[PDB]
Structure formats: C-alpha cells, structure tokens
Amino acid sequence: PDFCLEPPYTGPCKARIIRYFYNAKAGLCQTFVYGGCRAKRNNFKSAEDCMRTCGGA
C-alpha cells in the first residue's frame, strides 16, 4: 500500500498545524490541518518534502 495515497490524517491532538499531503486525485501536494500527534506518513513539513516523497504517485 502506497502511503502517498492515504487520506490526510489530522489525529487526536488539538493543535492547528499546517502540513502537506499528496492528493492523488488532484495530482498535487495540498495543505491540511495536523493535530500535532500520531502523524501518518502522508504528512510533510513543506511542499518540497511532499513532492520529493510522493510526486507522481
């Protein structure tokens, strides 16, 4: 299973941290709200990290 194809995971924590996830449907790295804990792998600190890891997925 390609972790790049998993829906973004906010998690149970209550922070409002902006992270990037690869949106396979749109074919681009998009922003989403991360709660601060228990992150999945389709969660990046920058668009560049996201494209390098999941670009073309």
Partner 1 sequence: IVGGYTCGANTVPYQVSLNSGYHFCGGSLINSQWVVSAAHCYKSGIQVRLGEDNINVVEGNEQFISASKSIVHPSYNSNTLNNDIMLIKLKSAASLXSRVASISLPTSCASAGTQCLISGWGNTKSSGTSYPDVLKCLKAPILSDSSCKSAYPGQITSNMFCAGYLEGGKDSCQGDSGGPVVCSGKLQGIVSWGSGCAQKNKPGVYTKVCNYVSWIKQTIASN
Binding positions for Ca ion, rule: CB under 5 A: 30-31
- The answer to whether 13 and 52 are in contact (CB under 8 A) is no
Angle at 8 between CA 18 and CA 14, to 5 degrees: 50
Q: φ, ψ for residue 52 (rounded to 5)? A: -65, -40
Binder of residue 5, out of Ca ion, partner 1, none (CB less than 5 to 8 A by kind)? none
Interface segment toward partner 1; rule CB under 8 A; list 1-9, 12-20, 21-29, 48-56: 12-20
CB closest to Ca ion, residue no: 30
Binding test (CB under 8 A) with partner 1, winner from 7, 38, 52, 57? 38
